[PDB]
Amino acid sequence: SGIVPQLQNIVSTVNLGCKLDLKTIALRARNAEYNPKRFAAVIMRIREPRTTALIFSSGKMVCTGAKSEEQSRLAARKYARVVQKLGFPAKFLDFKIQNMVGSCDVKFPIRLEGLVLTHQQFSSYEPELFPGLIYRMIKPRIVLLIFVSGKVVLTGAKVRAEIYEAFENIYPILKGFRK
Amino acid sequence: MLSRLQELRKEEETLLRLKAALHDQLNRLKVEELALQSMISSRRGDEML
Amino acid sequence: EDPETCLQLNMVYQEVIQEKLAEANLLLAQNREQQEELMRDLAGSYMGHFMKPYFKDKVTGVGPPANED
Amino acid sequence: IASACLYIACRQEGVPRTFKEICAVSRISKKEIGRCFKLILKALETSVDLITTGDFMSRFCSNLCLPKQVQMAATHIARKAVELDLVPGRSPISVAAAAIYMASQASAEKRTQKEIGDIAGVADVTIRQSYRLIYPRAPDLFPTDFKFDTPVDKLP
Amino acid sequence: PGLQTDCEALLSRFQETDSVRFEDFTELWRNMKFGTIFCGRMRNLEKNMFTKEALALAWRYFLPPYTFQIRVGALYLLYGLYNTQLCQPKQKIRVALKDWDEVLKFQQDLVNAQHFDAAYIFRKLRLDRAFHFTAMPKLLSYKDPSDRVMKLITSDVLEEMLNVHDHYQNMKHVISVDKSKPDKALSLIKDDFFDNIKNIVLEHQQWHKDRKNPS
């Protein structure tokens, strides 16, 4: 239809290109946490694009939380500059957007029971485990959490076009089951 | 208060049934009205000659 | 004779049934308002919450600081 | 894997139990049961039909000391409630517990939310939440020919 | 404590007479010895508290959604209670504001129906100043009802409906240019409207009786 999903999250990774001493970064960065009894990365937050970078001792950074590809690239470069200033030989190699969670609302209640009955080979609907139907789209390798309130959460895409084509594929199917 | 609540809801379903009947009557009435307009146009068309 | 009388009598019949529809829809409005009153009763709620510190945060639940008095 | 297979078999035969009725027996948490259940359905390339509310009724009403009349009552209530969309997107077990609570408080043998929560494996808060959804439409859900000693026009 | 039962008993023994005359209520008052509902030892505090409860209950029955017969019965009950009290500063009937415009139209319907007994009783209550014209009854802190279906449909409504319908048919028979058969554009009138509304009201009253019949 005319509604398109709003990207809510974008997970990207980057190779800083040098081994890091996480204790140093956690002692000198501005918003870092380092609980090596809970996870093995330094969790830095920033405010300008509102993203969270997990920085690893191998030099591989994971910037999550952005709402666009460009914001994610800018945030990753920001964390790169941060670790640079801390006296590390950090560069910006191999930036890759690894996930894009978009959301949307088709604005009509849906019959999940009928949908899983007619699409048994894709959808998984277990109301005991999750109140939403999990539709594994196959043309783009996307996963949709479709709910009875009409909300549809697309996730798993590497490119925004994948999110868009997945929602375009799923919209007629839901229109067929308009409660 | 569920006694009163169910009395009120039963009245509600009854009055919805009455509204359904009267609305069908209204729709068929306006269809008759359009039919009348069409045929009177056709019949006054036979005296403007 | 001439269906103009058909028009006028069908119009007055539409008028009386439209008065009936307005009355019935008003009863529907009053009954649905009664239903919503029942639901706000189910969703209604104390007086201890208004004791000695009458004002209090919805966050922490502590009163304002002391007056100068 | 054994617990997930037990659950899948119980579901396939047409007498499905809940994960809480397999975790209650197995030594692993419901989380792992559900994970391995999805993994098994993925591996075997098979599927299992969706549970309905009428599947958990011959067992819930029998584990409770309810008569057969109250059992068919709650069956009818739950089936009509899921029919009339009073409970959208809520798990069939909670709807079953709510319907059983309604038909129990209406009939001779009354059961509280606690006992029904223990049997069905549903938190009493969920019973409340999905009972308030079928609370106003109580009479048109019940069976027409239904004897009782507590007026269906008054229920908590 | 049991007072509502006596109130309902008197109102039922009254409505079973299908009468509005206050003489019948006087006969029931003397028969039930209802006036001695206050007789008996009790100190001033509990006495006027009980009187408050009784007047509030009778007034509650005086208002909708009760039948006209029940309402006139409750008006007579209010007269009999307020006039026979043991409290020296007689307790007053708490009249909310939102109920005044309904009580006034009820009094007007009483005097229009020439029910001068009940209308005179209400006038006597308003002259003796037996009312506290409050904002809400029941100071705040912290049966036989009337249906909407009779306001919708009754005998005269369906009578006028069938009159308009058969007049509509008789004018159909004359509008057509030929007397043998009407036009083929006007045959959409429904004959089951009476039958449909009859089915609806009969299902309603049948469900109503199988409701008031117990299991």
XYZ file of C-alpha atoms in Angstrom:
668
model
C 0.000 0.000 0.000
C 1.083 3.548 0.711
C 2.516 2.788 4.141
C 6.209 1.931 4.324
C 8.037 0.550 7.376
C 10.003 2.933 9.569
C 13.512 1.686 10.278
C 13.776 1.415 14.041
C 17.221 -0.100 14.459
C 20.360 -0.680 12.412
C 23.161 -2.976 13.555
C 26.469 -2.409 11.806
C 30.000 -3.619 12.391
C 33.444 -2.256 11.632
C 37.035 -3.422 11.930
C 39.127 -0.865 13.798
C 42.278 -2.648 12.690
C 44.272 -3.005 15.908
C 44.097 -4.982 19.117
C 42.726 -3.048 22.070
C 43.176 -3.091 25.829
C 39.574 -2.786 26.947
C 40.484 -1.872 30.524
C 42.199 1.278 29.263
C 39.183 2.352 27.221
C 36.838 1.673 30.122
C 39.066 3.732 32.389
C 39.376 6.642 29.957
C 36.213 6.792 27.835
C 33.276 9.009 28.704
C 30.320 6.619 28.802
C 31.913 3.202 28.618
C 31.054 0.204 30.731
C 33.239 -2.873 31.018
C 31.882 -5.801 33.019
C 34.062 -8.689 31.828
C 32.079 -10.885 34.205
C 28.936 -10.206 32.171
C 30.210 -9.691 28.642
C 33.577 -9.273 26.961
C 33.223 -5.865 25.330
C 33.269 -2.182 26.200
C 29.770 -0.728 25.929
C 29.998 2.896 24.818
C 26.938 5.104 24.357
C 26.659 8.404 22.540
C 23.977 11.075 22.332
C 24.197 12.734 18.915
C 22.952 9.731 16.872
C 21.917 7.858 20.049
C 23.849 4.672 19.327
C 25.589 1.976 21.343
C 28.933 0.513 20.313
C 30.265 -2.717 21.730
C 34.015 -2.551 21.197
C 35.916 -5.820 21.335
C 39.514 -6.619 22.158
C 40.048 -7.987 18.655
C 39.321 -4.520 17.316
C 35.895 -5.352 15.945
C 33.265 -2.779 16.860
C 29.498 -3.284 16.742
C 27.473 -0.072 16.460
C 23.767 -0.618 17.098
C 20.749 1.553 17.731
C 20.908 4.043 14.875
C 17.797 4.813 12.845
C 19.426 5.090 9.408
C 22.437 3.882 7.468
C 24.098 7.298 7.418
C 23.564 7.859 11.129
C 25.086 4.441 11.739
C 28.161 5.208 9.647
C 28.597 8.556 11.393
C 28.240 6.911 14.797
C 30.768 4.206 13.987
C 33.209 6.861 12.815
C 32.551 8.747 16.055
C 33.489 5.726 18.151
C 36.494 5.297 15.877
C 37.617 8.836 16.687
C 36.993 8.182 20.377
C 39.200 5.095 20.468
C 41.689 6.976 18.292
C 42.045 9.804 20.807
C 42.652 7.233 23.546
C 46.017 6.457 21.968
C 45.146 3.478 19.808
C 45.999 3.015 16.113
C 42.359 2.640 15.119
C 41.233 2.913 11.506
C 37.888 2.443 9.770
C 37.935 -0.801 7.794
C 35.116 -3.040 6.581
C 32.027 -1.173 7.735
C 29.041 -3.435 7.151
C 25.377 -2.991 8.053
C 24.498 -6.367 9.525
C 20.842 -5.881 10.446
C 17.892 -3.536 9.993
C 14.790 -3.772 12.166
C 11.916 -1.811 10.675
C 8.383 -1.562 11.987
C 5.024 -0.645 10.530
C 1.298 -0.767 11.174
C -1.144 -1.910 8.511
C -3.933 -0.376 10.631
C -6.402 -3.251 10.791
C -6.632 -6.265 13.106
C -5.386 -9.509 11.572
C -6.519 -13.122 11.873
C -3.332 -14.937 12.794
C -5.018 -18.343 13.026
C -6.189 -18.242 9.427
C -2.831 -16.916 8.275
C -0.863 -19.737 9.873
C -3.416 -22.261 8.614
C -3.003 -21.172 4.996
C 0.740 -20.452 5.180
C 1.884 -23.355 7.353
C 5.263 -23.673 5.600
C 6.431 -20.150 6.453
C 4.642 -18.946 9.550
C 5.145 -20.191 13.096
C 2.394 -19.250 15.530
C 2.770 -20.407 19.115
C 0.562 -18.315 21.401
C 2.165 -19.990 24.399
C 5.662 -18.834 23.471
C 5.064 -15.510 21.722
C 1.826 -13.611 21.113
C 2.906 -12.871 17.569
C 3.143 -14.895 14.378
C 6.662 -15.312 13.012
C 6.614 -15.316 9.218
C 9.944 -16.294 7.664
C 9.825 -14.595 4.289
C 11.861 -16.590 1.805
C 12.355 -14.311 -1.197
C 14.273 -11.850 0.961
C 15.557 -13.647 4.063
C 13.415 -11.480 6.348
C 11.489 -12.378 9.486
C 8.198 -10.669 10.276
C 6.573 -10.564 13.679
C 2.944 -9.998 12.738
C 0.455 -9.253 15.482
C -3.302 -9.177 15.930
C -3.171 -5.431 16.577
C -1.904 -5.022 13.019
C 1.673 -4.105 13.913
C 4.278 -5.777 11.712
C 7.929 -5.851 12.757
C 10.285 -6.734 9.918
C 13.792 -7.757 10.864
C 16.899 -9.459 9.564
C 17.584 -7.341 6.481
C 20.987 -6.046 5.450
C 19.579 -3.420 3.058
C 16.558 -1.152 3.333
C 15.254 -2.363 -0.030
C 14.926 -5.813 1.532
C 12.699 -4.435 4.295
C 10.578 -2.591 1.754
C 10.103 -5.512 -0.623
C 9.368 -7.821 2.302
C 6.597 -5.556 3.527
C 5.271 -5.246 -0.014
C 5.145 -9.036 -0.224
C 3.441 -9.384 3.146
C 0.843 -6.622 2.770
C -1.559 -8.405 0.360
C -1.379 -11.540 2.484
C -2.505 -9.605 5.552
C -5.152 -7.753 3.554
C -6.507 -11.200 2.747
C -6.919 -11.859 6.476
C -8.316 -8.493 7.550
C -10.175 -9.381 10.738
C -24.487 -4.874 38.737
C -24.173 -7.517 36.044
C -27.922 -8.141 36.270
C -28.612 -4.562 35.210
C -25.654 -4.707 32.815
C -27.120 -7.722 31.010
C -30.593 -6.194 30.958
C -29.092 -3.107 29.310
C -27.050 -5.120 26.800
C -30.087 -7.219 25.859
C -32.025 -4.024 25.281
C -29.021 -2.912 23.218
C -29.121 -5.966 20.952
C -32.891 -5.614 20.573
C -32.608 -1.955 19.579
C -29.741 -2.770 17.195
C -32.015 -5.352 15.566
C -34.720 -2.696 15.229
C -32.181 -0.276 13.747
C -31.085 -2.924 11.247
C -34.689 -3.466 10.158
C -35.397 0.270 9.899
C -32.132 0.872 8.022
C -32.996 -1.798 5.456
C -36.393 -0.108 5.152
C -34.676 3.261 4.615
C -32.300 1.900 1.969
C -35.074 0.215 -0.010
C -37.116 3.408 0.425
C -34.417 5.585 -1.138
C -34.019 3.035 -3.930
C -37.746 3.424 -4.607
C -37.199 7.195 -4.536
C -34.508 6.997 -7.226
C -36.803 4.737 -9.266
C -39.590 7.319 -8.950
C -37.278 10.142 -10.040
C -36.146 8.135 -13.069
C -39.665 7.235 -14.163
C -41.106 10.717 -13.635
C -38.268 12.184 -15.687
C -39.092 9.638 -18.392
C -42.822 10.427 -18.259
C -42.559 14.230 -18.217
C -40.187 13.704 -21.135
C -43.314 12.625 -23.046
C -44.979 16.049 -22.705
C -42.037 18.334 -23.550
C -42.370 17.203 -27.188
C -52.502 9.451 -11.396
C -49.126 11.240 -11.405
C -46.224 9.891 -9.316
C -45.642 13.320 -7.725
C -48.005 12.160 -4.977
C -45.864 9.020 -4.794
C -42.849 11.253 -4.190
C -44.524 13.282 -1.454
C -46.033 10.338 0.436
C -42.816 8.322 0.248
C -40.996 11.426 1.512
C -43.286 11.802 4.532
C -42.874 8.079 5.224
C -39.095 8.568 5.069
C -39.634 11.494 7.447
C -41.499 9.464 10.071
C -39.087 6.535 9.843
C -36.204 9.029 10.062
C -37.672 10.454 13.259
C -37.872 6.849 14.465
C -34.234 6.264 13.476
C -33.104 9.420 15.267
C -34.940 8.358 18.426
C -33.503 4.836 18.217
C -29.954 6.081 17.599
C -30.327 8.420 20.579
C -31.333 5.449 22.725
C -28.246 3.712 21.324
C -26.135 6.704 22.343
C -27.579 6.716 25.866
C -27.140 2.949 26.223
C -23.550 3.090 24.956
C -22.862 5.938 27.374
C -24.278 3.734 30.130
C -21.929 0.981 28.955
C -18.976 3.377 29.070
C -20.033 4.456 32.567
C -20.032 0.789 33.564
C -16.528 0.427 32.114
C -15.193 3.544 33.865
C -16.680 2.095 37.052
C -14.690 -1.085 36.408
C -11.668 1.169 35.754
C -12.247 3.455 38.758
C -10.208 3.573 41.971
C -8.068 5.940 47.754
C -7.908 8.429 50.606
C -4.771 7.275 52.354
C -2.896 8.484 49.292
C -3.973 12.018 50.216
C -2.742 11.901 53.811
C -0.115 14.043 55.535
C 2.060 14.639 52.445
C -0.900 15.532 50.222
C 1.378 16.393 47.311
C 3.886 13.784 46.255
C 5.886 12.821 43.186
C 4.425 10.309 40.796
C 8.058 9.184 40.524
C 9.482 9.035 44.036
C 6.376 9.707 46.106
C 7.836 12.327 48.454
C 6.208 15.630 49.290
C 7.581 19.046 48.455
C 10.289 20.512 50.690
C 9.327 22.168 53.941
C 7.926 25.688 54.004
C 9.772 28.474 55.726
C 7.018 28.420 58.337
C 15.029 -32.967 22.698
C 13.025 -35.603 24.551
C 10.738 -33.034 26.158
C 10.212 -31.215 22.874
C 9.398 -34.508 21.148
C 6.950 -35.373 23.911
C 5.219 -32.037 23.445
C 5.115 -32.411 19.659
C 3.673 -35.909 19.949
C 1.029 -34.816 22.447
C 0.121 -32.019 20.041
C 0.088 -34.272 16.981
C -2.173 -36.893 18.521
C -4.704 -34.157 19.198
C -4.508 -34.051 22.984
C -2.003 -31.196 23.304
C -0.581 -30.193 26.640
C 1.026 -26.869 27.445
C 4.747 -26.305 27.779
C 4.049 -25.749 31.456
C 2.606 -29.268 31.435
C 5.857 -30.660 30.023
C 8.247 -28.503 32.029
C 6.292 -29.689 35.063
C 7.522 -33.189 34.226
C 10.851 -32.727 32.471
C 13.959 -31.414 34.200
C 14.443 -28.431 31.845
C 12.879 -24.905 31.738
C 9.914 -24.111 29.397
C 12.294 -21.798 27.491
C 14.465 -24.711 26.386
C 11.400 -26.822 25.616
C 10.091 -24.128 23.301
C 13.473 -23.545 21.696
C 14.000 -27.226 20.940
C 10.366 -27.527 19.867
C 10.851 -24.885 17.200
C 14.194 -26.444 16.283
C 12.575 -29.856 15.853
C 9.726 -28.521 13.741
C 12.404 -26.810 11.660
C 14.580 -29.912 11.294
C 11.913 -32.551 10.682
C 10.333 -30.185 8.124
C 6.985 -31.046 9.688
C 4.300 -28.926 11.297
C 1.686 -29.223 14.012
C -1.849 -27.881 13.869
C -2.635 -24.820 15.944
C -4.072 -25.480 19.380
C -7.655 -24.461 20.057
C -9.389 -23.752 23.331
C -11.468 -26.925 23.231
C -8.366 -29.099 23.502
C -7.480 -28.087 27.070
C -10.970 -28.453 28.395
C -11.464 -32.201 28.811
C -8.351 -32.152 31.000
C -8.653 -28.856 32.876
C -12.249 -29.466 33.898
C -11.396 -33.041 34.882
C -8.315 -32.145 36.917
C -10.684 -29.774 38.636
C -13.614 -31.550 40.232
C -16.134 -29.882 37.887
C -19.068 -31.898 36.515
C -19.483 -32.717 32.851
C -22.191 -30.049 32.605
C -19.806 -27.307 33.714
C -17.211 -28.755 31.350
C -19.395 -28.512 28.248
C -20.469 -25.111 29.549
C -16.922 -23.753 29.665
C -16.187 -25.395 26.319
C -19.107 -23.540 24.745
C -18.176 -20.256 26.435
C -14.576 -20.430 25.266
C -15.455 -21.484 21.727
C -17.982 -18.670 21.390
C -15.598 -16.141 22.938
C -12.842 -16.955 20.471
C -15.585 -16.888 17.838
C -16.884 -13.444 18.804
C -13.327 -12.037 19.017
C -13.662 -11.018 22.660
C -10.096 -12.229 23.301
C -7.886 -11.028 20.431
C -4.396 -12.484 20.271
C -4.491 -14.016 23.739
C -3.207 -17.499 24.365
C -5.856 -20.237 24.267
C -4.850 -21.445 27.720
C -5.702 -18.141 29.384
C -9.015 -17.990 27.529
C -9.716 -21.557 28.629
C -8.965 -20.679 32.245
C -11.180 -17.596 32.059
C -14.078 -19.531 30.549
C -13.709 -22.282 33.134
C -13.719 -19.684 35.905
C -16.887 -18.143 34.499
C -18.699 -21.468 34.166
C -17.476 -22.471 37.625
C -18.593 -19.343 39.463
C -21.895 -19.564 37.595
C -22.578 -23.210 38.420
C -22.886 -25.206 41.626
C -19.232 -26.050 42.310
C -17.345 -22.759 42.520
C -13.600 -22.519 42.001
C -11.420 -19.512 42.708
C -8.878 -17.985 40.364
C -6.087 -19.644 42.341
C -7.078 -23.271 41.750
C -7.727 -22.637 38.069
C -4.361 -20.922 37.822
C -2.651 -23.920 39.384
C -4.379 -26.398 37.092
C -4.168 -24.471 33.829
C -0.738 -23.052 34.613
C -1.934 -19.477 34.117
C -1.181 -16.611 36.464
C -4.352 -15.391 38.148
C -3.645 -11.923 36.764
C -4.006 -13.346 33.270
C -7.238 -15.050 34.289
C -8.505 -11.667 35.462
C -7.366 -9.890 32.305
C -8.997 -12.362 29.946
C -12.052 -12.683 32.189
C -12.758 -8.960 32.049
C -12.698 -9.324 28.280
C -15.521 -11.884 28.429
C -17.072 -10.440 31.596
C -19.668 -8.194 29.864
C -20.747 -10.794 27.285
C -21.392 -13.552 29.827
C -25.002 -14.579 28.977
C -24.806 -14.945 25.210
C -21.733 -17.171 25.581
C -23.276 -19.709 27.954
C -25.344 -22.629 26.657
C -29.003 -21.744 26.294
C -30.250 -24.822 28.172
C -28.123 -24.425 31.279
C -29.148 -25.091 34.869
C -27.353 -23.354 37.720
C -27.819 -22.231 41.297
C -26.020 -18.881 41.033
C -27.642 -16.357 38.680
C -25.531 -15.850 35.579
C -26.717 -12.249 35.875
C -24.497 -11.810 38.944
C -20.824 -12.810 38.738
C -17.738 -11.205 40.344
C -31.816 -4.470 57.673
C -34.958 -5.970 56.164
C -36.479 -2.551 55.421
C -36.127 -2.865 51.650
C -38.071 -6.119 51.861
C -41.049 -4.379 53.466
C -40.808 -1.524 50.964
C -40.858 -3.983 48.067
C -43.683 -5.923 49.721
C -45.858 -2.830 50.020
C -45.049 -1.666 46.499
C -45.906 -5.111 45.128
C -49.158 -5.399 47.075
C -49.952 -1.988 45.610
C -49.027 -2.673 41.983
C -51.067 -5.871 42.081
C -54.150 -3.665 42.455
C -53.369 -1.943 39.119
C -54.638 1.246 40.762
C -53.356 4.768 41.305
C -55.934 5.976 43.824
C -54.409 6.954 47.150
C -57.377 5.421 48.973
C -56.027 1.997 48.018
C -52.633 2.902 49.438
C -54.332 4.034 52.637
C -56.051 0.650 52.799
C -52.712 -1.111 52.359
C -51.090 1.191 54.920
C -53.718 0.325 57.519
C -53.681 -3.337 56.485
C -49.904 -3.796 56.586
C -49.794 -1.544 59.665
C -46.878 -0.081 57.761
C -46.897 3.116 59.807
C -45.658 1.212 62.842
C -42.439 0.617 60.911
C -41.124 3.400 63.149
C -42.958 2.407 66.331
C -40.746 0.726 68.901
C -38.072 1.905 71.270
C -35.021 3.471 69.656
C -32.979 6.518 70.628
C -32.890 9.692 68.569
C -29.662 9.001 66.671
C -30.529 5.554 65.337
C -34.120 6.716 64.895
C -33.330 9.518 62.478
C -30.662 7.415 60.772
C -33.261 4.736 60.056
C -35.671 7.415 58.863
C -32.987 8.755 56.525
C -32.510 5.282 55.092
C -36.239 4.721 54.613
C -36.915 8.051 52.923
C -33.888 7.655 50.667
C -35.050 4.179 49.652
C -38.626 5.217 48.916
C -37.362 8.176 46.906
C -34.999 5.883 45.014
C -38.036 3.852 44.018
C -39.891 7.037 43.047
C -37.460 7.718 40.195
C -36.900 5.880 36.915
C -36.261 3.284 35.634
C -39.357 2.030 37.434
C -42.878 1.563 36.132
C -45.466 4.296 36.463
C -47.410 2.130 38.895
C -44.316 1.528 41.023
C -43.479 5.225 40.857
C -46.886 6.358 42.086
C -46.642 3.701 44.775
C -43.275 5.056 45.868
C -44.664 8.589 45.929
C -47.440 7.430 48.233
C -44.820 5.610 50.298
C -42.802 8.814 50.620
C -45.885 10.704 51.746
C -46.741 8.066 54.325
C -43.202 7.807 55.659
C -42.379 11.505 55.846
C -45.738 12.280 57.406
C -45.487 9.553 60.066
C -42.082 9.981 61.683
C -40.950 9.971 65.280
C -38.141 12.460 64.653
C -39.001 15.875 66.047
C -37.019 17.706 63.354
C -38.533 15.501 60.637
C -36.021 14.066 58.181
C -36.227 15.541 54.699
C -36.190 13.790 51.341
C -32.923 14.403 49.507
C -33.755 15.560 45.974
C -30.759 15.827 43.695
C -30.762 18.479 41.006
C -30.385 16.105 38.060
C -33.611 14.397 39.151
C -35.737 17.524 39.497
C -36.505 17.911 35.804
C -37.642 14.277 35.723
C -39.778 14.557 38.840
C -41.412 17.673 37.393
C -42.323 15.984 34.121
C -43.606 13.035 36.153
C -45.822 15.363 38.179
C -47.040 16.922 34.935
C -47.844 13.504 33.486
C -49.706 12.697 36.699
C -51.873 15.799 36.539
C -52.411 15.340 32.792
C -53.657 11.787 33.373
C -56.112 13.294 35.897
C -54.402 11.311 38.643
C -55.171 14.128 41.053
C -54.508 11.945 44.107
C -50.803 11.475 43.424
C -50.383 14.987 42.040
C -52.013 16.428 45.152
C -49.763 14.223 47.277
C -46.670 15.593 45.574
C -48.001 19.122 45.969
C -48.536 18.433 49.669
C -44.953 17.227 49.927
C -43.642 20.352 48.220
C -45.748 22.644 50.420
C -44.758 21.064 53.716
C -41.181 21.637 52.508
C -40.261 17.997 52.865
C -37.306 18.218 50.490
C -33.623 19.002 50.795
C -32.762 20.270 47.335
C -29.225 18.913 47.265
C -26.608 18.413 44.560
C -26.322 14.637 44.861
C -28.179 12.248 47.138
C -26.132 10.092 49.470
C -23.409 12.416 50.827
C -20.144 11.516 49.109
C -16.625 10.869 50.400
C -13.429 9.012 49.488
C -37.732 -5.698 40.210
C -40.150 -3.903 37.872
C -38.335 -1.651 35.369
C -39.313 0.144 32.162
C -37.833 -0.920 28.815
C -36.644 1.064 25.810
C -38.602 -1.238 23.493
C -41.986 0.073 24.618
C -40.731 3.619 24.046
C -39.714 2.402 20.580
C -42.638 0.155 19.617
C -46.146 -0.244 21.036
C -49.707 -0.689 19.799
C -50.285 2.768 18.318
C -46.870 2.922 16.623
C -47.432 -0.318 14.712
C -51.024 0.759 14.037
C -49.856 3.960 12.337
C -47.170 1.918 10.570
C -49.690 -0.492 9.048
C -52.017 2.406 8.205
C -49.257 4.177 6.285
C -48.289 0.868 4.643
C -51.765 -0.033 3.391
C -52.398 3.564 2.294
C -49.091 3.286 0.427
C -50.360 0.144 -1.307
C -53.695 1.769 -2.170
C -51.877 4.685 -3.787
C -49.612 2.263 -5.653
C -52.793 0.788 -7.118
C -53.752 4.200 -8.564
C -50.390 5.703 -9.577
C -49.832 3.161 -12.360
C -51.072 4.198 -15.794
C -52.984 0.893 -15.968
C -55.305 -0.550 -13.323
C -54.380 -4.196 -13.963
C -50.760 -4.109 -12.792
C -48.456 -1.567 -11.093
C -45.191 -0.377 -12.625
C -42.141 -2.646 -12.733
C -39.964 -0.001 -11.043
C -41.953 0.059 -7.771
C -42.237 -3.446 -6.312
C -39.503 -3.232 -3.667
C -41.808 -2.535 -0.713
C -41.390 -5.113 2.046
C -44.319 -6.888 3.699
C -42.247 -8.540 6.449
C -41.434 -5.295 8.293
C -44.377 -5.941 10.606
C -43.402 -9.618 10.738
C -39.725 -8.797 11.321
C -40.372 -6.341 14.156
C -42.856 -8.836 15.608
C -40.214 -11.571 15.538
C -37.761 -9.206 17.233
C -40.121 -8.128 20.015
C -41.338 -11.691 20.561
C -37.790 -13.028 20.842
C -37.149 -10.176 23.277
C -40.137 -10.965 25.498
C -39.506 -14.715 25.232
C -35.911 -14.268 26.365
C -37.242 -11.969 29.082
C -39.597 -14.636 30.436
C -37.045 -17.437 30.207
C -34.792 -15.054 32.141
C -37.285 -14.339 34.918
C -38.100 -18.043 35.012
C -35.421 -19.749 37.142
C -33.436 -22.895 36.364
